Write a protein that binds this ligand. Structure first.
Ligand SMILES: Cc1ccc(CO)cc1N(C)c1ccnc(Nc2cc(N3CCOCC3)cc(S(C)(=O)=O)c2)n1
Length: 289
């Protein structure tokens, strides 16, 4: 809390931003829409409430890692404020919503799946080069722009590796997206996010990650004992797509591809413009309406 107090900005956020309009809830807190009074840029603010914050060290890590690792494929952090018992986190606004709404309500073609994977891999190649392991890659941590921009968010679970203390060993993430080495409690590397991306590609195909009908503990045991998840209907996908997924979901960490390596895959060469994701966004919004 003392370290937290010395990260936040000076000044009234209520007097710096106006046109506040609630666009969601509510795990970590309320999400509002706003407009910068001086610039006119449209911003997205999350009101946290520190009483519902369990670890707290997480909130500082999220803020610090977002700050130090700015890239076109990472939701652009603006500023933070502590009004009174509440923590306000100001970011660029991505009105397109989350990938979750797209994967759960729409059927994505191979060219669109490829486009998202490419952008997601660009975010990962950036973080892994800066020795940052995201650890919670899943459709829910992908925000879309109205133009079709793909941006990575939620850095609360991330780990900073060093040539001295790398790999990592703590069972962190969301069960259904976790790599077998994470679940089994082995020392793991950045390639855990690659596995999480393969699961997110399965979401894009099937609408949900393997074992979602199960309870998280069962899923942990199913990822541990079964490994590489089998698809409902593999025959529906192309060979180059079937290959991209095998490289993402390989049990052998050394065999599993890096973001640098997967960015060169034949699959991403069939990727469509990001404007091809705008009819998906339009359908998701109509479906969840
Ligand atoms: C304010 C914020 C701060 C820090 C971080 C880092 O964790 C993320 C954000 N968020 C969640 C952002 C950032 C930029 N843009 C958006 N856009 C957006 C979010 C939502 N949700 C709110 C409820 O929970 C799920 C996400 C809904 C819609 S929509 C469908 O109404 O157009 C748009 N949200």
């Amino acid at each position: 809390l003392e370290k937290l107090r010395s990260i936040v900005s000076v000044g009234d956020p209520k007097k710096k931003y106006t046109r506040f309009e609630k666009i969601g809830q509510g795990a970590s807190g309320t999400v509002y829409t706003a407009m910068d009074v001086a610039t006119g840029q449209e911003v997205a603010i999350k009101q946290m409430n520190l009483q519902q914050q369990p670890k707290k060290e997480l909130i500082i890590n999220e803020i610090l890692v977002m700050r130090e690792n700015k890239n076109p494929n990472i939701v652009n952090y603006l500023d933070s404020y502590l009004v009174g018992d509440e923590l306000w986190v100001v970011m660029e606004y991505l009105a397109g919503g989350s990938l979750t709404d797209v994967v759960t309500e729409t059927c994505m073609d191979e060219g669109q799946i490829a486009a998202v994977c490419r952008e997601c891999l660009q975010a990962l190649e950036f973080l892994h080069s800066n020795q940052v392991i995201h650890r919670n890659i899943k459709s829910d941590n992908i925000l879309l722009g109205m133009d079709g921009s793909v941006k990575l968010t939620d850095f609360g679970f991330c780990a900073q590796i060093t040539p001295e203390q790398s790999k990592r060993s703590e069972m962190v993430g969301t069960p259904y997206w976790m790599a077998p080495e994470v679940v089994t409690r082995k020392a793991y590397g950045p390639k855990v996010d690659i596995w999480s991306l393969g699961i997110m590609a399965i979401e894009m195909i099937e609408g949900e990650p393997p074992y979602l009908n199960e309870n998280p503990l069962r899923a942990l045991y199913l990822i541990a004992t079964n490994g590489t998840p089998e698809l409902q209907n593999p025959e529906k996908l192309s060979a180059i797509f079937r290959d991209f997924l095998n490289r993402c979901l390989d049990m052998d960490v050394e065999k599993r591809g890096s973001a640098k390596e997967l960015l060169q895959h034949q699959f991403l060469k069939i990727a469509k413009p990001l404007s091809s994701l705008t009819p998906l966004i339009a359908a998701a919004k109509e479906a969840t309406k």
